[PDB]
Amino acid sequence: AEEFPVPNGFESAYREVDGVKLHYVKGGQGPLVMLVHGFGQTWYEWHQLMPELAKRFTVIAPDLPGLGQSEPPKTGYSGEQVAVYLHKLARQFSPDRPFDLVAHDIGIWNTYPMVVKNQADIARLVYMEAPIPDARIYRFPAFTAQGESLVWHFSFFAADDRLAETLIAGKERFFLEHFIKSHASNTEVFSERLLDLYARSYAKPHSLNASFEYYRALNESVRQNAELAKTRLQMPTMTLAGGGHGGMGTFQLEQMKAYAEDVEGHVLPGCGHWLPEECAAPMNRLVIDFLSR
Amino acid sequence: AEEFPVPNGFESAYREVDGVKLHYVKGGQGPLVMLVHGFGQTWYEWHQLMPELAKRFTVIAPDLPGLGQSEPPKTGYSGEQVAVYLHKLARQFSPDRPFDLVAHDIGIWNTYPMVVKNQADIARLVYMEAPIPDARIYRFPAFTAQGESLVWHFSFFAADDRLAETLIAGKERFFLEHFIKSHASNTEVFSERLLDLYARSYAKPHSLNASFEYYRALNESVRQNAELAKTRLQMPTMTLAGGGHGGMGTFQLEQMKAYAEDVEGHVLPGCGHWLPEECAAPMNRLVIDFLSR
Numbered sequence: 314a315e316e317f318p319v320p321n322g323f324e325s326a327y328r329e330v331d332g333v334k335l336h337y338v339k340g341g342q343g344p345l346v347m348l349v350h351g352f353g354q355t356w357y358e359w360h361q362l363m364p365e366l367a368k369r370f371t372v373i374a375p376d377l378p379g380l381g382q383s384e385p386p387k388t389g390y391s392g393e394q395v396a397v398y399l400h401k402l403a404r405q406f407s408p409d410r411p412f413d414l415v416a417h418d419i420g421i422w423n424t425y426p427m428v429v430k431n432q433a434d435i436a437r438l439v440y441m442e443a444p445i446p447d448a449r450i451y452r453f454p455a456f457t458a459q460g461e462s463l464v465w466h467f468s469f470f471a472a473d474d475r476l477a478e479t480l481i482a483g484k485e486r487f488f489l490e491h492f493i494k495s496h497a498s499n500t501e502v503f504s505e506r507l508l509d510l511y512a513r514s515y516a517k518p519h520s521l522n523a524s525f526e527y528y529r530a531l532n533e534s535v536r537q538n539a540e541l542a543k544t545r546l547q548m549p550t551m552t553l554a555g556g557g558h559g560g561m562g563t564f565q566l567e568q569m570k571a572y573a574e575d576v577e578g579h580v581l582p583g584c585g586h587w588l589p590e591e592c593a594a595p596m597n598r599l600v601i602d603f604l605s606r
Numbered sequence: 607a608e609e610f611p612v613p614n615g616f617e618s619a620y621r622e623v624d625g626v627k628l629h630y631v632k633g634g635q636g637p638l639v640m641l642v643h644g645f646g647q648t649w650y651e652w653h654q655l656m657p658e659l660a661k662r663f664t665v666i667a668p669d670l671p672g673l674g675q676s677e678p679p680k681t682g683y684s685g686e687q688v689a690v691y692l693h694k695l696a697r698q699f700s701p702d703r704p705f706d707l708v709a710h711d712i713g714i715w716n717t718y719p720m721v722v723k724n725q726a727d728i729a730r731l732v733y734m735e736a737p738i739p740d741a742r743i744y745r746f747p748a749f750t751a752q753g754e755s756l757v758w759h760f761s762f763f764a765a766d767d768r769l770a771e772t773l774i775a776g777k778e779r780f781f782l783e784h785f786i787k788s789h790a791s792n793t794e795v796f797s798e799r800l801l802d803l804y805a806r807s808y809a810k811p812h813s814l815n816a817s818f819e820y821y822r823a824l825n826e827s828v829r830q831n832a833e834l835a836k837t838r839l840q841m842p843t844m845t846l847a848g849g850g851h852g853g854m855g856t857f858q859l860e861q862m863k864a865y866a867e868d869v870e871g872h873v874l875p876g877c878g879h880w881l882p883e884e885c886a887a888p889m890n891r892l893v894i895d896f897l898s899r
């Protein structure tokens with residue numbers, strides 16, 4: 314049983330990594346590109362980009378531990394722990410060459426440590442729409458003159474007593490629609506069918522919990538990254554962010570400038586947080602061209 | 607019926623003010639002091655302080671519009687709108703003499719405009735444990751290096767689509783225990799029995815909604831107060847804040863200095879947001895002494 318439909322020419326498969334059964338969707342030929350999703354979503358956010366990339370690359374899109382059809386991590390949900398699973402998965406398919414990495418939202422949190430610790434393994438890097446966990450996150454405001462802020466959910470999701478699971482259970486589809494649309498410019502791309510699919514996936518009890526455990530580990534991830542960031546990133550890097558409602562704007566590139574020597578950035582007007590779906594055509598073009606250099 | 611037990615020698619009654627039936631508890635004799643509660647609670651938070659004050663004052667403790675046993679406001683939930691109800695209620699009992707005011711949490715939001723617009727009616731003022739709505743509220747962080755921030759709930763409660771009521775309805779007792787304890791230093795005073803009492807009151811559907819409408823009106827109150835604050839407060843004022851987990855600390859006094867000519871402030875160590883219950887002895891003493899000047 315597949316939670317989401319597989320594109321023609323791709324296969325849905327699993328690999329055991331350190332005792333954890335990881336789900337992924339894979340297709341194409343050539344050097345490896347790994348695409349890593351974020352919160353509220355699964356591998357499927359990449360389903361429009363995948364067949365285009367597959368003309369030039371071997372493409373793998375895993376479900377993050379605990380999410381989609383992947384088993385929860387057996388170590389923990391901090392960025393360093395999760396990055397081990399993703400790094401070892403990629404290396405199963407690209408043992409002798411460096412691979413490319415594209416990540417969105419918490420996919421960034423879950424890959425940054427393996428990028429900085431294994432720089433020779435990473436040919437090119439694309440990061441979109443999330444802060445790397447560092448002290449900058451403590452400056453985002455709780456409330457705005459226009460209403461709810463961008464990241465008040467950091468506290469909601471990190472709270473103890475299973476606050477988020479307890480309040481959201483039974484209302485998973487309702488909450489996810491609110492959350493997605495509050496962070497979107499182009500809400501029309503999120504059809505009832507698409508929202509149904511994403512909601513059913515993250516509503517699995519272990520997935521609903523896994524979702525928030527990433528946030529419960531965020532402060533630990535920040536502390537981890539304070540040490541890791543002493544080593545700058547050397548590989549060619551591109552950042553993308555949305556310039557419309559829900560987007561990170563200039564923050565993405567400005568933060569990345571502190572981490573990478575060789576970085577170019579784009580802000581996409583008329584697009585919010587969910588770039589692969591809200592602004593598929595220009596986002597896909599920018600990623601494809603950057604990786605094809 | 608009575609949601610909370612009246613202290614001996616006090617009466618529970620109602621007064622219609624501009625078409626809205628307000629509930630209050632009243633006792634004692636002498637000059638009038640009005641005690642105004644905050645979010646998650648009702649007049650009952652004052653029930654330990656009330657007998658002591660009643661030896662020297664006529665004491666009234668109303669339920670805020672829509673909360674406890676008071677009807678929702680008919681105008682709106684902004685600070686200026688709600689303050690009219692409270693000012694008129696007080697002046698019914700003290701038409702020819704100024705009265706004293708003690709306010710906690712959103713009790714501050716709902717009284718500040720009537721204090722500034724009717725300064726001669728207010729003899730002495732005590733404010734505790736919340737910001738006066740102004741530009742400073744936009745500087746509070748969404749997330750902290752320790753975990754959930756003090757006021758991330760501002761965004762949760764203000765969110766469109768009735769997000770908060772939809773998630774919290776039917777889980778009111780769970781939510782309130784988490785909210786209260788997470789804002790406390792001395793959590794032990796919040797017995798299951800006491801939490802049962804508070805939760806039953808705010809679980810009334812009109813009360814759960816009313817609670818959040820105060821936050822949906824917060825930006826309006828900020829705009830209102832930008833004009834009002836052009837006139838400084840002239841009457842003797844005292845601020846209190848908790849110095850422990852969940853408390854406002856030095857912020858309370860520092861903000862009040864911008865608003866008042868004559869102000870003294872105290873931070874109570876080992877006490878969080880819920881001063882009358884967490885630290886009844888020192889808080890009650892500070893209030894009684896200040897008013898008895």
Ligand SMILES: CCCC[C@H](O)CO
Pocket residue numbers: 351352418419442443444463464496559561586
């Ligand atoms: C909305 C910007 C991205 C920040 C985090 O990844 C939120 O889940």
